[PDB]
């Protein structure tokens with residue numbers, strides 16, 4: 443009556459092949475980009491173009507990726523769940539929980555002024571929290587429980603996406619014209635990246651697919667380069683454009699308040 | 708070369724004694740209080756005295772406690788971690804992650820007006836997120852890793868407590884006189900309850916103590932009755948007093964803006 447574990451990273455694997463090389467190279471590249479962006483944002487801080495949100499995101503991502511590179515499978519980075527015989531990437535989900543709220547806070551503070559926050563920002567944060575928590579619970583469970591939690595997380599995510607779309611449209615119609623193009627791209631980067639995470643979940647060992655750990659982590663690396671680093675670069679670019687507009691227009695941005703939008707789409 | 712699990716709730720335990728009876732009675736009582744407060748807040752919603760935060764907190768607490776009563780040890784409510792041989796109360800920590808942000812959001816929105824949120828509210832939310840995530844990581848790990856994560860969570864918690872103290876002092880010096888007493892009590896209920904969670908952690912199977920699951924859960928039940936239900940009742944009471952003041956004073960609360968405080972203590 444023995445019990446062998448058979449979790450990811452316990453039995454020795456012949457880590458060879460082009461896919462593993464690409465995997466490690468992409469982790470190293472993401473770490474390097476994150477740390478470089480961290481330094482660059484630290485230098486840009488004094489010009490009020492890079493807020494604490496992007497710096498924190500880059501910092502946390504750098505630690506995430508260094509732990510991935512050197513201790514991907516040693517706990518607590520890998521949570522080994524016994525009865526379900528599952529391997530949860532707890533480092534990945536912890537990084538999600540840290541950053542996604544900060545990404546949404548930066549989105550709600552795209553310009554940096556005071557008094558622009560609203561109750562809907564807090565509701566957005568709550569929905570994102572629920573979505574990611576239910577994703578973790580689905581990852582740590584099996585069977586119908588996992589599917590139910592995935593569905594609840596999907597509902598939370600639909601609400602979160604609707605709120606974020608409202609924020610993006612408001613930013614587009616309030617921010618100066620010079621930023622409009624940038625905003626569109628950022629929105630794409632927001633939706634192209636985020637939407638990747640739910641699908642990999644279905645295709646990986648978590649969920650009901652059969653992706654290798656390396657392929658799933660490669661997809662997550664790309665989705666992180668998109669959702670975090672590119673999104674932060676766009677955020678910093680937009681803030682720089684806003685600073686230039688402030689310099690050209692006596693320091694004040696155009697003032698729109700107590701209006702309505704979102705008609706039709 | 709066999710491996711027996713020995714997690715909480717696997718080997719049959721003779722669930723008998725006065726302590727178990729008190730344990731189950733307190734879980735049932737907390738569930739009943741939470742659901743009753745949920746209904747009561749739903750009725751009070753239309754008078755703008757009970758916000759969505761307390762309703763959500765009561766709702767989530769009711770589900771937490773029903774799952775505790777009926778499936779405390781079945782996963783995903785109990786995460787069984789293999790190499791570390793630990794039993795993480797994932798339902799408890801999920802409920803923490805859901806509610807603590809909402810409690811802080813309600814604290815930052817004690818009055819309910821628009822434009823009262825600030826960047827410091829978002830930083831507070833980030834610090835609370837980090838604190839609870841590090842608490843979970845410590846719970847799921849062992850040895851020096853757990854101690855290090857506990858220390859980082861403690862630092863996050865000190866920052867969170869400092870921010871909350873600032874919020875409480877601002878509420879005390881901005882809200883009407885009639886509410887001052889209430890505010891003090893709420894602060895106590897906030898600090899008496901929250902400070903209980905770090906200590907039980909040290910004394911339980913999580914951490915480095917030897918509390919029984921039942922005693923730890925009893926302590927957590929009391930700390931939840933204090934931090935959530937009593938705190939929500941005080942929040943609703945304060946909002947009712949504010950509504951009365953608004954009725955007596957043409958609907959507007961006293962207006963204080965762009966001032967400073969926190970000198971000395």
Ligand SMILES: *C/C=C(C)/C=C/C=C(C)/C=C/C1=C(C)CCCC1(C)C
Pocket residue numbers: 537538541542573574576577580591592595596599636637639640641643666669670
């Ligand atoms: C930096 C990391 C980010 C932005 C991660 C985002 C992750 C998601 C949006 C995940 C969503 C979901 C799952 C992965 C599974 C359950 C269903 C969702 C939609 C909540």
Ligand SMILES: *C/C=C(C)/C=C/C=C(C)/C=C/C1=C(C)CCCC1(C)C
Pocket residue numbers: 802803806807838839841842845856857860861864901902904905906908931934935
């Ligand atoms: C509704 C539940 C609440 C308010 C739970 C609160 C929990 C804490 C404040 C926990 C704090 C910590 C630990 C339990 C362990 C690690 C150190 C702390 C301070 C982050």
